[PDB]
Amino acid sequence: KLVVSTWGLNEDVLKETVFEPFAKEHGVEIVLDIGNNSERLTKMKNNPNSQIDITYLAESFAEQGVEAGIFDKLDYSKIPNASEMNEKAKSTVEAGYGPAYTLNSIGIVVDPSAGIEINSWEDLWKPELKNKIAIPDITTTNGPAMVEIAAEKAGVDVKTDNGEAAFKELEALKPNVVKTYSKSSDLANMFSNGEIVAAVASDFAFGTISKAKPEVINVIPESGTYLNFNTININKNSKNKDLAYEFINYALSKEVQEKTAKALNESPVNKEVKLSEEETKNLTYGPVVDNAKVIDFKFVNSVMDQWVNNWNRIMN
């Protein structure tokens, strides 16, 4: 029996595509413990007798579990498929705990009919964009990326000054920000109503906005996009670790990565995957990944309370 802590979104497809084949191949039963990142993480951190074997989380939350001492540092000699991960995703392998099994990216979604040229992240600060952009809130997946983007503009890495210069650049961006968001649905309507001309948004969000306003384009600055990952960890209290390792190795396999890309719109971390143009629609795939930047969540989580305070003080 393998107990899996996960979101369980599109549960039927998820079971059909990922868990059932594994269960049948290994002659075992899979049980899901579902909920959102925060509730699942909170429960396992406070439960002395957790029965969870493996845990799926966004990297930001996974790092909090690592810090809490809930997850095992992994023996990658038992996960040979990790050798097939792209160089950016391998940053999670180097970290030593659970590896990324999927990735996502951001871009600048732009309505080109406004005739305002936007090519780089720094262009978001142009005076012509007064009252015309939306950015992700600090509490969302891409909040940290937004602070790092501001750090690039300032020319001071957040590890040098804990982000103070980045926050001064965020103050400077204020006249152009219509709102900080949290919902993808929110952006589609803002573009449809002409409330914004540009938004820093995820690959998934570009797809949603495009359905409402097909003329929008997705600009990826030459300096590089920012990636975020979801990872799989083995719980330290697990009594089924050999099977847990087999499962992670399976989740990273070329076949499972291809199946989940197609069935669940999960961008692959396995560089050997064969996918068509229609299949990679709205996924993050290709050269974009090679030039991308990754975030150090060990560092970011250590300054998150400060960042949230600073962000709210500045943006409201």
**Residues making contact with Cl ion (CB under 5 A):** 43-44, 47, 50, 58-60, 228
Contact between 210 and 201 (Cβ < 8 Å): no
What's the min distance (Å) between Cβ of 168 and Cl ion?
25
Select from 140, 124, 147, 136 the least CA-distant residue to 310: 147
Between residues 100 and 198, which has the closer beta carbon with respect to Cl ion? 100
Query: What residues have CB less than 8 Å from 40, skipping those under 6 apart?
Result: 5, 6, 33, 34, 55, 57
What's the min distance (Å) between Cβ of 207 and Cl ion?
19
Amino acid at 179: K
Q: How far is CA 85 from CA 51, 293, 301, in A?
A: 29, 16, 25
Amino acid at 255: E
What's the min distance (Å) between Cβ of 31 and Cl ion?
12
What's the min distance (Å) between Cβ of 126 and Cl ion?
29
Between residues 59 and 266, which has the closer beta carbon with respect to Cl ion? 59
Which strand (E) or helix (H) includes residue 230?
Answer: strand 227-234
Amino acid at 94: E
Between residues 38 and 83, which has the closer beta carbon with respect to Cl ion? 38
Between residues 47 and 223, which has the closer beta carbon with respect to Cl ion? 47
Between residues 43 and 78, which has the closer beta carbon with respect to Cl ion? 43
Between residues 174 and 298, which has the closer beta carbon with respect to Cl ion? 298
Contact between 226 and 152 (Cβ < 8 Å): no
What's the min distance (Å) between Cβ of 291 and Cl ion?
19
Gap between the Cα atoms of 268 and 104, Å rounded: 9
Contact between 270 and 135 (Cβ < 8 Å): no
What's the min distance (Å) between Cβ of 60 and Cl ion?
4
Between residues 210 and 267, which has the closer beta carbon with respect to Cl ion? 267
Indicate the residue whose CB is closest to Cl ion. 50
Between residues 108 and 300, which has the closer beta carbon with respect to Cl ion? 300
Gap between the Cα atoms of 103 and 86, Å rounded: 11
What's the min distance (Å) between Cβ of 96 and Cl ion?
17
Gap between the Cα atoms of 74 and 242, Å rounded: 11
Q: How far is CA 41 from CA 36, 57, 71, 140, 288, in A?
A: 8, 8, 11, 17, 31
Kindly state the tokens that stand for 233.
């960890």
What's the min distance (Å) between Cβ of 50 and Cl ion?
4
Between residues 142 and 176, which has the closer beta carbon with respect to Cl ion? 142
Contact between 17 and 263 (Cβ < 8 Å): yes
**Strand 100-110 relative to strand 267-268, pairing:** antiparallel
What's the min distance (Å) between Cβ of 297 and Cl ion?
7
